[PDB]
mmCIF file with all atom_site columns, C-alpha atoms in Angstrom:
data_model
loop_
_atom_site.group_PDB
_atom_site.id
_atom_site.type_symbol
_atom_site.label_atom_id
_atom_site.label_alt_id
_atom_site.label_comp_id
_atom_site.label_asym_id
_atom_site.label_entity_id
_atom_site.label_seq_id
_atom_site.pdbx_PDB_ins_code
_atom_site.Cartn_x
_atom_site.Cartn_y
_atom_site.Cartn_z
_atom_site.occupancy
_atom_site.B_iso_or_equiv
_atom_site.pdbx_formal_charge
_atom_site.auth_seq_id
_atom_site.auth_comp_id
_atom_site.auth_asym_id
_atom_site.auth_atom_id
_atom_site.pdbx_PDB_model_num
ATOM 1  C CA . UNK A 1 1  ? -13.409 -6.632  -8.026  1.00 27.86 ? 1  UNK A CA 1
ATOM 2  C CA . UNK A 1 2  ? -9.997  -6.944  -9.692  1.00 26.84 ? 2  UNK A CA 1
ATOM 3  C CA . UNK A 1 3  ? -10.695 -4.746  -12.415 1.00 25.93 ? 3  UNK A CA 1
ATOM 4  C CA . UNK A 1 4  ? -7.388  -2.972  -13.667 1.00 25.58 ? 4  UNK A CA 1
ATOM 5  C CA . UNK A 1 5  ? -5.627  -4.968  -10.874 1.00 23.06 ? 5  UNK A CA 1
ATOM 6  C CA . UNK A 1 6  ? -6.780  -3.826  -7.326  1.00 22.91 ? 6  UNK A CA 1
ATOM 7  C CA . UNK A 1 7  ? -10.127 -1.998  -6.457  1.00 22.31 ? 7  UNK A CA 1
ATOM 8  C CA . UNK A 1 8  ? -9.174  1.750   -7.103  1.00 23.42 ? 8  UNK A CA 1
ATOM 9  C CA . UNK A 1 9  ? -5.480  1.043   -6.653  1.00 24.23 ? 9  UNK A CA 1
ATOM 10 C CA . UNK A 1 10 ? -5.164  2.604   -3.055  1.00 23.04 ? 10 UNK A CA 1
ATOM 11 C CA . UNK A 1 11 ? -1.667  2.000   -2.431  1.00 18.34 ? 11 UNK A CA 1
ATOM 12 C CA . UNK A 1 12 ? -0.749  5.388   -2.208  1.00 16.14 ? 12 UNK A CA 1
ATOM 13 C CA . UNK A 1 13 ? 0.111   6.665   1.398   1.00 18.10 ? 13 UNK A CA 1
ATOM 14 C CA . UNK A 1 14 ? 0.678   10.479  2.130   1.00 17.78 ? 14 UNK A CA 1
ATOM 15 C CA . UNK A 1 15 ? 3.655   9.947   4.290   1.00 15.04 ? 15 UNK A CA 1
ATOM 16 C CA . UNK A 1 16 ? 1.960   11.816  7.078   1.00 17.42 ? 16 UNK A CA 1
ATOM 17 C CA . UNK A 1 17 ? -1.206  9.713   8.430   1.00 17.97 ? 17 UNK A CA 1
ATOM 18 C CA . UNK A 1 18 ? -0.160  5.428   8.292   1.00 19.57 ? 18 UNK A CA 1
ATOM 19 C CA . UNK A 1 19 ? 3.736   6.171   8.065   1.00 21.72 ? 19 UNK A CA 1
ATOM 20 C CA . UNK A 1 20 ? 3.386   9.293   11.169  1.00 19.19 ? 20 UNK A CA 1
ATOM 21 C CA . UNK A 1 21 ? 0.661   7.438   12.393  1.00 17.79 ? 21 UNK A CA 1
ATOM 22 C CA . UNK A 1 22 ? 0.364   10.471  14.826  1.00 16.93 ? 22 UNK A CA 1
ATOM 23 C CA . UNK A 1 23 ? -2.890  11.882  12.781  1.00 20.56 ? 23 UNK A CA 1
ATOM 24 C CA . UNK A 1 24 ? -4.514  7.872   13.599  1.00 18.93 ? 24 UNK A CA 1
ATOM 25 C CA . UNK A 1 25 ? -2.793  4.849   14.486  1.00 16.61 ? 25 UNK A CA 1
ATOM 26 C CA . UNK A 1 26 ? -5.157  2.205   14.409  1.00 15.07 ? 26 UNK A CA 1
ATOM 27 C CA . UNK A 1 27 ? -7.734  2.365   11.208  1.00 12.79 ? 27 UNK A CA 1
ATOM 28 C CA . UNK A 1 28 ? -4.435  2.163   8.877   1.00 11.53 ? 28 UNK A CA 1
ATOM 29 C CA . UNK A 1 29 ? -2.856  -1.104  9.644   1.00 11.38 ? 29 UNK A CA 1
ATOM 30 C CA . UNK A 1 30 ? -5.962  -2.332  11.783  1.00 13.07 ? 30 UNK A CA 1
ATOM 31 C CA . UNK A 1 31 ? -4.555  -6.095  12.382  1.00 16.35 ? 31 UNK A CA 1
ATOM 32 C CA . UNK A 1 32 ? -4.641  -7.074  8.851   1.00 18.63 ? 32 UNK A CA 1
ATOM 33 C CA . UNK A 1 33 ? -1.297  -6.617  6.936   1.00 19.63 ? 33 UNK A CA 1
ATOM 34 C CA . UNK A 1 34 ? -3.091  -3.527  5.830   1.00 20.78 ? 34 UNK A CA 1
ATOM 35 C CA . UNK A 1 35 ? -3.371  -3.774  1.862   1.00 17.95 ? 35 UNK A CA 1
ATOM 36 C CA . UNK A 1 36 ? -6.455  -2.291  1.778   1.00 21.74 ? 36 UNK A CA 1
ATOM 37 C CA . UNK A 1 37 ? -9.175  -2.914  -0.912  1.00 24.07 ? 37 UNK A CA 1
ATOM 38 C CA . UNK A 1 38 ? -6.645  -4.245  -3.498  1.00 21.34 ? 38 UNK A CA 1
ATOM 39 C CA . UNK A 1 39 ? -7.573  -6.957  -6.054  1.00 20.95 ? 39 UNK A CA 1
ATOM 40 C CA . UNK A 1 40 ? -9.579  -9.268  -3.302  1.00 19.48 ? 40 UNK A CA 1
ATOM 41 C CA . UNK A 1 41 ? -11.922 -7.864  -0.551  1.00 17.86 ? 41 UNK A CA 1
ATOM 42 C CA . UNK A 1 42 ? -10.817 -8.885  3.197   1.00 16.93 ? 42 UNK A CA 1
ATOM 43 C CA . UNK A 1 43 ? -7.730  -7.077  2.883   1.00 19.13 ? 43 UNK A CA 1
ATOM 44 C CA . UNK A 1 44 ? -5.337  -9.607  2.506   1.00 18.63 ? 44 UNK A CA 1
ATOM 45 C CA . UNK A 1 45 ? -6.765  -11.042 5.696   1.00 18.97 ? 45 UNK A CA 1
ATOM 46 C CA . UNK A 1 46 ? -7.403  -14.780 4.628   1.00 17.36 ? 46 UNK A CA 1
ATOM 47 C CA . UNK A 1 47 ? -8.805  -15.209 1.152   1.00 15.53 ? 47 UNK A CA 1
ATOM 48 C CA . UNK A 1 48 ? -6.024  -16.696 -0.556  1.00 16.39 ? 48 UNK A CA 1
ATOM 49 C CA . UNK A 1 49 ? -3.734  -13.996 -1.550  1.00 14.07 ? 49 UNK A CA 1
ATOM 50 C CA . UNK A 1 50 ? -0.956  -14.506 -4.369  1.00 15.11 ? 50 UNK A CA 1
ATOM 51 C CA . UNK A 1 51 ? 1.694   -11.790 -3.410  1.00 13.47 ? 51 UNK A CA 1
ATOM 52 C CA . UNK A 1 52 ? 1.905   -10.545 -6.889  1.00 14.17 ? 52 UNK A CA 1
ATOM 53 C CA . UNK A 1 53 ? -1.438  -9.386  -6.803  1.00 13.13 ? 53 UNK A CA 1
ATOM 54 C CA . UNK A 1 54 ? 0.117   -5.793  -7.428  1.00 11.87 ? 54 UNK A CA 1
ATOM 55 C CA . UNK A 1 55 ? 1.559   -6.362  -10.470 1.00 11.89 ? 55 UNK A CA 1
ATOM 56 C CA . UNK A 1 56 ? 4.284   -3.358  -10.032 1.00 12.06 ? 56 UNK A CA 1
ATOM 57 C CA . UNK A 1 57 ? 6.226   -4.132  -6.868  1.00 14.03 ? 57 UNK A CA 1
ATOM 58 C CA . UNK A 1 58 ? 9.299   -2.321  -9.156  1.00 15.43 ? 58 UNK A CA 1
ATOM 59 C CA . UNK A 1 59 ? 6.744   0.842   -9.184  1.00 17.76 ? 59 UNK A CA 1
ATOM 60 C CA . UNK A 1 60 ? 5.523   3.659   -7.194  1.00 14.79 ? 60 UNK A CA 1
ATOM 61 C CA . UNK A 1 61 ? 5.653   7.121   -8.999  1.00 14.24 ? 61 UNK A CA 1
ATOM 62 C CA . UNK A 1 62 ? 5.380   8.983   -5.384  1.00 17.00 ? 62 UNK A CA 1
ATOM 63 C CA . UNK A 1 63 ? 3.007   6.185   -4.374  1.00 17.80 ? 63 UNK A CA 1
ATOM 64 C CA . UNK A 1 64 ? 4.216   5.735   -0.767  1.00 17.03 ? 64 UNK A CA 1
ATOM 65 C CA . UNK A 1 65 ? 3.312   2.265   -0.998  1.00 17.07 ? 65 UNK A CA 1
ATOM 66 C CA . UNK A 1 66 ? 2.930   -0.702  1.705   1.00 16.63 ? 66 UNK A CA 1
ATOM 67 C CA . UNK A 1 67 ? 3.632   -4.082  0.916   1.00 17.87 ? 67 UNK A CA 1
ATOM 68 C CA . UNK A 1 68 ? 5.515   -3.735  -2.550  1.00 14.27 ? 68 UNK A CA 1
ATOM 69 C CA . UNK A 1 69 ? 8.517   -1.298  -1.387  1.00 12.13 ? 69 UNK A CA 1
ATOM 70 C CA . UNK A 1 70 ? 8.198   -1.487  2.439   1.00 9.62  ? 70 UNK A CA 1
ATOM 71 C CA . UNK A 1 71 ? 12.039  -1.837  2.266   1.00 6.91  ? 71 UNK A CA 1
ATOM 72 C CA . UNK A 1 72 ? 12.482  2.253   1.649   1.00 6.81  ? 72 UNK A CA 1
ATOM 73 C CA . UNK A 1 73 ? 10.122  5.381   0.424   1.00 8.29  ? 73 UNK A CA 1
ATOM 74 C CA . UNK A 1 74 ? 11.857  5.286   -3.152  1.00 5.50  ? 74 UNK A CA 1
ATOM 75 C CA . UNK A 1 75 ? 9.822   7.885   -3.996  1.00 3.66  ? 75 UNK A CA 1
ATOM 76 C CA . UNK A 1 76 ? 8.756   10.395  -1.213  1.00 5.69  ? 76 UNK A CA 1
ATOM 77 C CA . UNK A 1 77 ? 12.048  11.493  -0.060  1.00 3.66  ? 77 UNK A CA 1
ATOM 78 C CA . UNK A 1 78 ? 13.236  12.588  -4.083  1.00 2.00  ? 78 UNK A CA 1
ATOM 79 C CA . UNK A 1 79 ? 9.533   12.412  -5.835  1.00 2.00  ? 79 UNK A CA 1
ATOM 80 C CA . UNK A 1 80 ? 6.307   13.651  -4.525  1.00 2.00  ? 80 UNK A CA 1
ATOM 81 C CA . UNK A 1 81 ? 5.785   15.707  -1.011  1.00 2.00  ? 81 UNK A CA 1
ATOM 82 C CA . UNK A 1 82 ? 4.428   13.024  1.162   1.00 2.00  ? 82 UNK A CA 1
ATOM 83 C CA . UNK A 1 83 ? 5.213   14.819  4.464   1.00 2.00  ? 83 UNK A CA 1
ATOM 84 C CA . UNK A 1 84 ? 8.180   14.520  7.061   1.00 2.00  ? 84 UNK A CA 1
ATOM 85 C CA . UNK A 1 85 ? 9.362   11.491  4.595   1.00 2.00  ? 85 UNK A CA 1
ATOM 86 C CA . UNK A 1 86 ? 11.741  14.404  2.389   1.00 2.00  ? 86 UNK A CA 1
#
């Protein structure tokens, strides 16, 4: 565990499935402030998280991320194809 900075970085949504949450709606945020496998295991449930974990709240790249940029896409709508997000 935190290697580069999360587990596999997985803060990447598709802008279809836990934004649409049509496809699921349940698995994605699943009662935990989502964050999935970042840099602690638990999910950000109750380990002792730091906030700045993510080291790049300023940047996505088409990410679609969660926690960092929650505010807006900044990056689906004029960067990568997420979905219904253009």
């Amino acid at each position: 565990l935190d290697p580069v900075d999360p587990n596999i970085e997985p803060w990447n949504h598709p802008g279809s499935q836990p934004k649409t949450a049509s496809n699921r709606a349940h698995a994605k945020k699943s009662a935990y402030h989502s964050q999935v496998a970042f840099i602690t295991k638990g999910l950000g449930i109750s380990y002792g998280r730091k906030k700045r974990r993510q080291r790049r709240r300023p940047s996505q790249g088409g990410q679609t991320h969660q926690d960092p940029i929650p505010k807006q896409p900044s990056s689906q709508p004029r960067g990568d194809p997420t979905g219904p997000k253009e």
